[PDB]
Amino acid sequence: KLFQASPSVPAKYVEDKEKMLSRTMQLVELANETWLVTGRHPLPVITAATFLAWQSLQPADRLSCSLARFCKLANVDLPYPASSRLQELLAVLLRMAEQLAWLRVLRLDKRSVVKHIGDLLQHRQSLVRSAFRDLLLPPCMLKSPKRICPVPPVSTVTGDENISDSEIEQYLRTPQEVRDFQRAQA
Amino acid sequence: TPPGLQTDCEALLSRFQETDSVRFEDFTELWRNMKFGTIFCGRMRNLEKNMFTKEALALAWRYFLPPYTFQIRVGALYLLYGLYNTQLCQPKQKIRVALKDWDEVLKFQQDLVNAQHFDAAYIFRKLRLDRAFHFTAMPKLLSYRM
Amino acid sequence: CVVEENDPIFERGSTTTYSSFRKNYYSKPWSNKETDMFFLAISMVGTDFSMIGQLFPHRARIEIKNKFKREEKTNGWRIDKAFQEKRPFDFDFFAHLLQKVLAEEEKRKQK
Amino acid sequence: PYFKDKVTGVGPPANEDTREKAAQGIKAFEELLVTKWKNWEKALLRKSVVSDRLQRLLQPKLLKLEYLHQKQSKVSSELERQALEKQGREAEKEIQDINQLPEEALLGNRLDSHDWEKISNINFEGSRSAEEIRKFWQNSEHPSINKQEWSREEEERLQAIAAAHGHLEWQKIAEELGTSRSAFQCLQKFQQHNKALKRKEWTEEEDRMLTQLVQEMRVGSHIPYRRIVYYMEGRDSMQLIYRWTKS
Amino acid sequence: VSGSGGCNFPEYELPELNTRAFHVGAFGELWRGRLRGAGDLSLREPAADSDREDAAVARDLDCSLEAAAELRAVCGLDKLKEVIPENTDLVTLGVRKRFLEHREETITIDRACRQETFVYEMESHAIGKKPENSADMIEEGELILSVNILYPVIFHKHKEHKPYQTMLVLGSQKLTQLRDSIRCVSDLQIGGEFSNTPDQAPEHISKDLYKSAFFYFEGTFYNDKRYPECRDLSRTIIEWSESHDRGYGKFQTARMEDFTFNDLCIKLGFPYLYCHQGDCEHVIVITDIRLVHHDDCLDRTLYPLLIKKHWLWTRKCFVCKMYTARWVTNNDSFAPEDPCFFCDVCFRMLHYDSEGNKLGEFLAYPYVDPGTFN
After folding, report:
1. Which of A127, C74, E101, E362 is deepest in the core (most CB within 10 A)?
2. Looking at the record, which segments are called SNAPC3-binding (chain B)?
3. In angstroms, rounded to a whole number, what is the distance separating the alpha carbons of residues B118 and D186?
4. DSSP helix, strand, coil percent of chain E (3-state; round to 5)
């Protein structure tokens, strides 16, 4: 509802429809080309992208606004992983800023790169190319996976046909344990 | 509230709590031997002394409001009486009172009319005639600064 | 008639809604002493989860089964040692240990 | 406490009197307030100006590199491919030299064209006005300004040059002074060091107005000497105090 | 519209913050009714004296001199303690001596007490002043209300909050008098561009142009209808308040020249609004309600004066730093800053040549400094 000025939402939060939709489309294309939507729910990424676009269209006024605050103002059920998707997308944007010259000198962060998100999408092709030159995977896999799929020791020792009857007896329940179980489940 | 003046008032009330009930004999003995009123002129400055006396009277009357024993009530009321009758100070102050406090003291007077507290009644009558009571809604000034 | 017994909720945005896929389970984790006494109960009974759930009132049988599967998948040597060792079934002392665990979790909540 | 008793601040309607006040030009004392500048604000200003300059320099180069990439991806010829690669490497070397240039020339001259409103609303979140940022960058945030204090050899020269020129143009006075400073600081120090105009030798025509002030707006014993000076032009605080306090 | 039904006694609602709703006219009426007064005349005393008090006690309850003759002798000054306050077991005297030492350390003689002397003189201005005409004598029992006002933002938000002046008002008098007595800087403020014509006298100040003003007390809108150029912003206010079910009930509208302080229904310590010139809003805090006394101002013509004239710092000329600024310039090249400030002589000698021609392009406006009333 950020297109028409309603009583609840003031005019500051209201932004243009076409420009914000184009920015969200560019952001979700970036997410699809940076391996962010593959394997994850798409709608959280869509929400994160539209939120970043709404913040980049006017960083000053809504720099303090949070994801839950935006969901409340828009009357939309907040997706759970949307926050994580936002944290990953902003990290990718920081990588793009490090790729760019003036931004890597400015030394921005996950809160100050929102004002230059727009510039990042101007030439995002070469930026993403260089970012992949220097694969997006879950955080649980990028923790220096040194021993990938450790080879288990093959143990095909079958004996002749069995082992012994001591294990049979140790598996069989003793009369004491039988009586105890019967007393317990009486 | 004035810290040291409140301390002095409470100490004098504690002493009145062991003095006689209502008779002015012990009040005279105190005013003679202890002279609770000492810091009134000294060598201080105009507004310092003014606010001193103002807060003194204000809190001494605010302490008259809650219900206590006759000792404490007489003590507070006539401490106020003495502090007002020894007003060698020049500016106008008047004791800070409340709206319903007037009806409370009116019921007190109606009780003295049947009680044998003639000395207390006469002193309160003189205090009324001296035009010492100034009434408000709150025993102090209040705003929305908090 | 409902005499202001409930409050209207401004939910169910007609526009759209998403899915959850996770509703109820919301289990509660274990601790070191709880894992120790759980291995004791294993060594004392076996793999029959019915008796284990009966003797554990405060933990669900499904959670106990999940824990046993996790131990079978991660710590096999511990399960082997538990099955190697054996203890006769104790009831009164086990109830005393249950009271002790209740007191311990009460102290934990206090902390 | 609060200053929003009636309209809390959620739906305050801009009424006719409000829009008329806004469109007439009556700016009493609200927008004209000035706040002191901070060190992190100075750093942010410098960083924003440098980034804006570098971005405006690189954007044409980036568009040219994009055009070269499009030519590479669309042209299937091999003879022109060598020329395209040579031009791409030339553009790469140009960008390399631009990035290698030291951080002393990319700040701009004293009076250069920039986008003050853009820089403000992007970096300063609108807290600093575009005009204030322009002035601060033109006369207080340049590396060519002499931060050294006046070495007792500028006041006399400045007053002489001002007498020669006509006291009409601070900029020309400062340029004739030639100490590589901003005219604002020069005039500030000159007027803080120089003598007053010495209107008259305490004629009672002004003393009677001072007495009228003492009778109409004085409260007790303290005297608002600044209220006095506001009407008694050509005077100074210390002298007026010492003189008017007596006799 | 009748007043809100409530007891005259101001029953508390929040601890040491404010009381509940109540009326003012009935408050004062009951206040005068529950006592006889007849003491605000200063006629105690400048011969037969015993018989008069004997007859007085004869109407009193005791009708005897047994206790009075002793108590009047006891309650004297000849038996009362100038002398140095020492040589006695005390408590507050320690703090007194510590303050005396702290004073002898740095405080020099008897001065630096600016606000103190201000309060002293502003309180003495109302001591025993008689009216010029005999018909202007304030009757006994008149309601005196103390009302703090917070108009401005330019002050210490840190120092426990003290932005603006406090006033005293009489009950029987009209609210229009308070309206006209509030000394707002926005009333002296003047709008218009005068860069090309600096010598032109600014005419039609904001006080005369924007006559729109209205009070707001407990949902009641008092709009001034004394002048034929006053608009009604309460119309748009009510439109906004009623366009949506925001929880605000219906508000009543009345005239300011027909409702006095007595007819108001206020809460001591509760903030009310006084909005004029569109956006110039004052937070009104009515703190105390008291009756008239012979020690207070007995002249109805200037009972409303001022009691807390908060000091304000004037904006000095940015060029010379010796005179208070009178003109504000925007988009001025010769000016060192954007929100710049100049006085008459500096502005004339900087922005104009030897003949008076406008040197350079800029936008100049008459800067009415806030420190114009004091």
Report:
1. A127
2. 1-146
3. 84
4. 25, 20, 55
Determine the length of chain C.
Answer: 111
CB A98 within 8 A of CB A120: no
Q: C86-103 burial string, b = 16+ CB within 10 Å, else e?
A: eeebeeeebeeeeeebee
Q: Does A5 touch chain D (CB under 8 A)?
A: no
DSSP class per residue in A59-101: TTTTSS--HHHHHHHHT-PPPSTHHHHHHHHHHHHHHHHHHSH
Chain D contact for A63, CB < 8 A?
yes
Paired residues of E22 in beta bridges: E266
Beta bridge partners of E214: E223, E275
DSSP letter for each residue of B46-78: HHHHHHHHHHHHHHHHHTTSS---HHHHHHHHH
Chain C contact for A155 (CB, 8 A cutoff): no
List the resolution, Å.
4.8
Three-state SS across B114-130? CCCCHHHHHHHHHHHHC
Maximum C-alpha span of chain A: 84
A61 CB burial (10 A radius; 0-12, 13-18, 19+): middle
Residue D202 near residue D160 (C-beta atoms within 8 A):
no
Strands E166-170 and E213-217: unpaired
Listed as own residue / partner, the contacts of E235-242 with beta carbons closer than 8 Å and 24 or more positions apart are E236/D13, E236/D15, E236/D16, E237/D6, E237/D7, E237/D13, E237/D15, E239/D13, E240/D11, E240/D13
Is the CB of residue A104 less than 8 Å from the CB of residue A97? yes
Chain CA centroid to CA E248, Å? 30
Q: Do chains A and C touch (3 or more CB pairs under 8 A)?
A: yes
- CA A14 vs. chain centroid, Å, equals 28
DSSP for D70-93, please give it. HHHHH---SHHHHHHHHHHHHHHH
Nearest in space to A67 (alpha carbons), one of A57, A58, A79, A56: A79
From residue E160, how far is each of B108, E155, E157, E298, E304 by CA, in Å? Answer: 40, 11, 7, 34, 26
In the block, which residue shows the tokens 């209040």? B142
* Spatial CA neighbour of D11 closest among E275, A66, E236, E253: E236
Contacts of B146 in chain D (CB under 8 A): 1
Which residue has tokens 């942010």?
Answer: D44
